[PDB]
């Protein structure tokens, strides 16, 4: 493959380590996203090994709620990633625009997320950075896990995002796949509320609220959503509701309107 095998339609925006373009593969007239990475830039920033780990994980994952990497090619100066195009774009922009999601929208995303994470966990892949900014939306608004920047095939690596950090990470303990259970609970809360649960003016007060699980549910939340969130946001990782438990949760069953995209 070469860039000449594609018609670049338009830029989609800045992605991690490079610009993303909407492109059509001339032969099959197939619309996809094309991420362009500059080989020298990757070397200068010292992110080659970090990009290789992400490509290695994302290219071997095949799930309707995981953004697909079809293939990759390179020339003298650039590495091109042939990626699934998610037509509805950034989930965070949608959250920002609406302020908060309704129960249907949130439960659908939770079912899609738990299914994608279960698929990962089954393959010993821990995401470690589930948050709205790492999610894209498909043609029918279906969730697409799009960033695997902190992911690992398995830990002590202190990683993720402040508001989403599990207690065990803040406390410098070893962690396992159960960090994704905690982040799923923080995500569910943020979807429904519009803000993460332990939001505070200072890092020390956010750390304090996380370790004490200082969860203060707004009165507009249903009993069902609070039930799911409380079951995920457990201080002790083994007490956290498993991903199969999220999928089976009565609030998810009653509210999700998940549709599986057509297969070939």
């Amino acid at each position: 493959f070469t860039i000449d095998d594609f018609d670049i339609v338009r830029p989609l925006g800045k992605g991690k380590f490079g610009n993303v373009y909407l492109a059509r593969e001339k032969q099959n007239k197939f619309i996809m996203a094309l991420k362009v990475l500059f080989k020298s830039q990757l070397e200068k920033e010292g992110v080659e090994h970090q990009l290789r780990r992400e490509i290695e994980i994302q290219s071997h994952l095949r799930h309707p709620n995981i953004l697909r990497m079809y293939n990759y090619f390179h020339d003298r100066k650039r590495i091109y990633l042939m990626l699934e195009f998610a037509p509805r774009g950034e989930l965070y922009k949608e959250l920002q625009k609406h302020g908060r999601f309704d129960e249907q929208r949130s439960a659908t995303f939770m079912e899609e997320l738990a299914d994608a994470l279960h698929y990962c966990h089954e393959r010993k892949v821990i995401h470690r950075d589930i948050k709205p900014e790492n999610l894209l939306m498909g043609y029918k608004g279906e969730l697409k896990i799009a960033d695997f920047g902190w992911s690992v095939h398995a830990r002590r690596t202190m990683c993720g995002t402040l508001d989403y950090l599990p207690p065990e990470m803040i406390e410098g303990k070893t962690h396992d796949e159960k960090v994704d259970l905690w982040c799923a609970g923080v995500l569910c809360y943020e979807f429904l509320v519009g803000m993460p649960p332990f939001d505070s003016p200072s890092h020390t007060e956010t750390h304090r609220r996380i370790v004490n699980v200082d969860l203060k549910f707004p009165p507009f939340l249903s009993d069902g959503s609070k039930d799911l969130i409380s079951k995920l946001l457990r201080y002790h990782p083994p007490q956290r509701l498993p991903l199969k438990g999220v999928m089976e949760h009565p609030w998810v069953k009653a509210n999700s309107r998940r549709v599986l995209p057509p297969v070939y």
Partner: peptide, 22 residues
């Protein structure tokens, strides 16, 4: 646009990407 219709058609009639690209 004509692009919007092609994106729609791609969702409903997906291609074997594993064979075409993989």
């Amino acid at each position: 646009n004509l692009l919007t219709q092609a994106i729609r058609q791609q969702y409903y009639k997906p291609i074997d990407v594993d064979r075409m690209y993989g």
